[PDB]
């Protein structure tokens, strides 16, 4: 039953009861982005370099926690990593601890949803690797320019 001048109650008068710290403020964050129960989370453990592939799969069209405009823009930007069964698939590699991997996946997802839910995204493209693309495009467009109907 010991107490000191420096004890936890007299330092912070406002909160006292021993159950104060363990309260759960589910009202504080009601957003609950990424309801992890709704994701398929796979662990491929590669030991030898030691790294654990962690994978996050979910159906994009069937995912209701994301708005419709966002759910449609995602299927545009990320269609490369979408699967023929309609599954969006994220993958992380780096750490040997799959906590860190899962965290990387979830952060990736958060960021994708973030940039897709922003209408202000201008999708700015660099001219470094795309110079070849623009020039070879233009130059296949010089040939494509022949006009007579066919078929």
């Amino acid at each position: 039953e010991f107490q000191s001048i420096y004890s936890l109650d007299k330092l912070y008068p406002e909160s006292r009861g021993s159950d104060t710290a363990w309260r759960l403020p589910d009202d504080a964050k009601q957003a609950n982005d990424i309801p992890v129960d709704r994701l398929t989370i796979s662990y491929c453990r590669s030991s030898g370099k030691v790294n654990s592939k962690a994978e996050v799969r979910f159906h994009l069209a069937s995912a209701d926690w994301i708005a419709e405009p966002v759910r449609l823009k995602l299927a545009v930007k990320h269609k490369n990593r979408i699967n023929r069964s309609g599954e969006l698939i994220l993958t992380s590699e780096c750490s040997r601890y799959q906590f860190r991997n899962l965290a990387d996946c979830l952060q990736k997802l958060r960021d994708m949803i973030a940039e897709a839910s922003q209408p202000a995204k201008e999708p700015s493209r660099e001219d470094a690797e795309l110079r070849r693309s623009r020039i070879e495009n233009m130059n296949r467009e010089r040939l494509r320019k022949k006009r007579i109907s066919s078929a």
Partner: protein
């Protein structure tokens, strides 16, 4: 069992007369006698070496010595004052619980870790305590109330996920010494000293709920604690509704060394009694 025994019937008594050191145990020493080991006796010929006088160790023969031509640079600079936290992986903690060295039932602090010999602290070497590292995070299934002096985010998360509680507490050198080896302290015949505070450098560490600091504001605790669960993607259990919860919330006073004892008491171990000061000044001092 040992078929060797059956041979021992056949042979004469083992006595002092017949005893052989294990072969190879004693490499016989050799003396400078005789043709081989005599006549200059391994010392060479004239010079400084046969006479025994060759110079000291670092000396290169007068050219500026190697160990002195290299410039001084703080490497070991102020090393004696750096803080040292003996690491404890979740792997070892789990292995310790599994074999029932430490029991997860009662709260786990430094003294419990020492008593299981899961860890060893030597305050004289400026060990400030145990730090928790994440080595076994993925495999860690036990549910614990643990108190260490430093911890990593991943370690903490790994303990929360299983519904336990981590807290980072500070001990000063004297405190720490007493905490690791209590029974030799109680034979000392001294009161139980106050636990000192952290110095100015370590205060911002122990005041943050980020670190589950023992000096932190418990208002922030559930918030940060939930933030962890967002980041590592697991459902945060309600510790409140558990049956062992009374043990899980257990703290120490920031000024208190042990669980259930108090600064200024005296443990008489021959009578199995505690002695407490009734004086006003003493009680003011120890309780401040």
């Amino acid at each position: 069992g040992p078929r060797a025994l059956d041979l021992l019937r056949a042979l004469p008594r083992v006595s002092l007369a017949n005893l052989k050191p294990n072969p190879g145990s004693r490499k016989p020493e050799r003396r400078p006698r005789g043709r081989r080991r005599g006549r200059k006796c391994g010392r060479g010929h004239k010079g400084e070496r046969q006479r025994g006088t060759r110079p000291r160790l670092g000396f290169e023969g007068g050219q500026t010595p190697f160990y002195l031509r290299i410039p001084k640079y703080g490497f070991n600079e102020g090393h004696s004052f750096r803080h040292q936290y003996q690491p404890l992986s979740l792997n070892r903690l789990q292995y310790l619980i599994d074999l029932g060295r430490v029991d997860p039932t009662q709260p786990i602090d430094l003294t419990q870790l020492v008593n299981g010999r899961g860890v060893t602290i030597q305050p004289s070497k400026r060990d400030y305590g145990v730090q928790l590292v994440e080595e076994g995070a993925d495999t860690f299934k036990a549910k614990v109330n643990i108190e260490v002096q430093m911890a990593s985010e991943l370690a903490i998360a790994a303990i929360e996920k299983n519904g336990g509680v981590v807290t980072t507490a500070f001990y000063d050198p004297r405190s720490l010494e007493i905490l690791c080896k209590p029974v030799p302290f109680f034979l000392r015949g001294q009161p139980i000293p106050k636990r000192m505070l952290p110095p100015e450098a370590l205060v911002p560490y122990y005041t943050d709920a980020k670190n589950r600091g023992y000096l932190a504001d418990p208002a922030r605790f559930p918030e940060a604690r939930l933030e962890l669960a967002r980041k590592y993607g697991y459902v945060l259990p309600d510790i409140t509704k558990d049956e062992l919860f009374k043990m899980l919330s257990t703290r120490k006073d920031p000024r208190q060394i042990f669980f259930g004892l108090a600064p200024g008491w005296v443990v008489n171990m021959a009578d199995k009694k505690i002695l407490k000061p009734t004086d006003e000044n003493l009680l003011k001092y120890y309780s401040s």
